[PDB]
Amino acid sequence: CSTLSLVRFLELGLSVACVCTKFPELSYVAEGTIQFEVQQPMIARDGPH
Amino acid sequence: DRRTAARLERFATVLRAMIRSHVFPHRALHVLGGLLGHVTQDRLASVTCVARGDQEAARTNDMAARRSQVHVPACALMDVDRELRLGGDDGLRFAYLVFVYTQRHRREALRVHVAVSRLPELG
Secondary structure: OOOOOOOOOOOOHHHHHOOOOOOOOOOOOOOOOOOOOOOOOOOOOOOOO | OOOHHHHHHHHHHHHHHHHHOOOOHHHOOOOOOOEEEEEEEOOEEEEEEOOOOOHHHOOOOOOOOOOOOOOOOOOOEEEOHHHHOOOOOOOOOEEEEEEEEEOOOOOOEEEEEEEEEOOOOOO
């Protein structure tokens, strides 16, 4: 006979490349979004301009 | 500045050409207020002048004389009332910058003045 090599995804090191969360109501949501805000630093020049 | 007297000569020729071509310099020079401050790079400046209100409401970064006044070359300041002999008494008087054209082809010039008086309408 032959066995069946089972494998769980969280054991593999590839998991640390993404966050996985169950969302049991995904079948209902329309196109979802995510909002970023970012604030670029600035350095003080001087002179004429 | 370098080459300055030459530039003054060329500017003279420019204005004398302007009157000859009937595009008068008064249609080429709007007037701003009196300068108070500036920061200069090498041959590049940023002047700052008042535009309304009285001059000494400003604040210059001299630290010897924070406020200022208004200086005009006395050679050009032409008074009017004491000139016209209105018999008036000096109170609050207006201030007018006037240009004087003269037109004779290839022999022409421009005269500048700064006129003060009580007259609201020069005319």
